[model samples]
Target chain A: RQVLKTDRLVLEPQSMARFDQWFAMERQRDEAGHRDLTEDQAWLRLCARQGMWDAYACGFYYLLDPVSGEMRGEAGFQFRRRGFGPGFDNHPEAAWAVASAHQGRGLAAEAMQALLAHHDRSSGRQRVVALIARSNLPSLRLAERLGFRGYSDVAFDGAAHLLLERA
Target chain B: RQVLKTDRLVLEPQSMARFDQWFAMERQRDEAGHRDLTEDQAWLRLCARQGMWDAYACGFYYLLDPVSGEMRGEAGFQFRRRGFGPGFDNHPEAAWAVASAHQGRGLAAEAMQALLAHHDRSSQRVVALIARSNLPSLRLAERLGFRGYSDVAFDGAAHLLLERA
Candidate 1:
């Protein structure tokens, strides 16, 4: 029942009926440089993300494609509780990814303008954080534009990540 | 992998293969308060709550009876974000139930002591919204571990939100 919209994008919560579509799109990802989730992992994510709507009342949204009528990307907050502490750990973590073919459009930025506001209107949680790749300057720049600033430096997945906060 | 256990109860995450059994137990409600969930609603909750274990690594556990290796109740954290708004939303939801015949033994409580201690103790807090009509559940929530966090109206009746450490 909770859906967000932008002038150019429609942010729909992922539904199980369309998971295959989302999975097909996810298969094409190294979306923002991270690798694809295994099918089981992705399936697990779909269930939890959808459950977020029922449990937390807010969750990541799938950005729909016009001509294809399939979802191509996802953006919004995740209460994933992934055990990342101090930075993007406990609060609603801002996360987004788009298919490589759709890269460079700034669609994630556009859709999240509404998604963050949607989070603000709904979530009482005060602060949000994200983990962005240190090497991805484009996303780093996008993070800056999205009102996030460096909060900490962390090592994860055998790599360095800059934890940014909308502090 | 996060399955919880008690001295006598083997807690199982609700399974799709046994939806009928889950549905069957749900059909026997008024154990503590109201009518059981319908078959369809129960199925959706099954899918979604089953999704919870994968997504959040913990979910509600079904209680097994040793007498027949059958489920007699359930207890644990529900990521069930019902539209109760505010206090009930935005936090881990706690829920539990035992069959009418199994009342007075504290099986539900024993199951939850394991569920809560195992899950939320490492984390922080959980919330439960109990219907006023269901004082049995409210007393159960009280006996478990909770603060009377707040009160509000929901489902055209009064609901109390219980918060925990």
Candidate 2:
């Protein structure tokens, strides 16, 4: 997959050798309680999701700083099984997270905005969804700012998951 | 590690050979929109956490039906980072889930109770946090006698922090 870039950020797909750097971001995501993927877990997820990105051209990409070339976070969409019946099966779910030190610059929103633009140009999927935790106000605001509207609420793994959709 | 048992269920620590059976339950959890682990995520988690269970004696377990020896669910503890602050770092978080077919039988509560008992016998200060919307989990914690001592907002949701001392 080609790199998806914005004016200030670079979004790159997963590469095998980049596991160490990716794992660092994954650990940071875990410490922030955003994502809890261990090294092995991150690698596994990369193996599976990256394949989809290659084959179908739809999946996550790591967010990077253009100037420093540092991995700031991740942003993209992938087929996620939400168990909300057939309507939600294998639906594209949008997710983005920024590293602690790299946050507060509106980078996550910018990265996600770039991904949405990429999807619009390359994908056939008409709609995408964002599953935001109720407590994550910034992301909720980002989703709403990008035209996503909440359509459902569900309890997931002891979290209040709100599903928002953009078409 | 030894298998922990209650009157109706067997709580065995995860093993490599049991991956298929355990993955089946993991898939069920995914289908229920609880845990969205992919095949790789599930395998990697098992490999890593099972190592912890073997080396450190604290990790996840498979909840089994004694007579049938089928994996009905999973229940156990692990160090969780709640991203709340230093107060929540390396906190022993309690987690439990039952297969869709096995749910509503009070199995989750049963397995968790057994794991809690095991923790009481071997561990120290513990806490379990649940999402505010999940009433069943809140009820489960209460039944386990965990006090709902506080609440916190994180990751865009309100969590009721229940501590069992």
Q: What share of the true interface contacts does each candidate keep?
A: 0.18, 0.00
Q: What is the TM-score of chain B alone in each candidate?
A: 0.85, 0.88
- Best DockQ goes to which candidate? 1
Instruction: Give the lDDT of residue A144 in candidate 1.
Output: 93
RMSD of each: 17.4, 12.7
Clash counts for the predictions, in order: 2, 5
Over B1-165, each residue of candidate 2 has an lDDT whose tens digit, in order, gives 789888788988866568668877777764533367665456545655554553346878888889999988888886544455555545677878788887798998878877888788886767777888889888888899888777888557898777788
Give the lowest summed-lDDT range of ten residues in model 1 chain B.
Answer: B31-40
Model 2, residue A90: C-alpha shift (Å): 0.9
> Candidate 1 residues B1-165, lDDT tens each?
545667888888765556667777777775422365644346555656766765566777778876687887877776543555655654688888786567788797788778777775557678887887887778778877877877788657888888887
lDDT of 2 by residue, A1-167 (tens): 68877888888875544666877777766443336664434554555554455334577788778888888887787665546654554567788878888789999888887788878887654788777888888879989988798988888668897878898
Q: List the residue pairs that clash in candidate 2.
A: A134-B156, A135-B156, A135-B157, A136-B155, A136-B156
Alpha carbon lDDT at A135, candidate 1: 85
In Å, residue A82's CA in model 2 sits off its true spot by 3.2
Interface RMSD of each: 12.5, 9.8
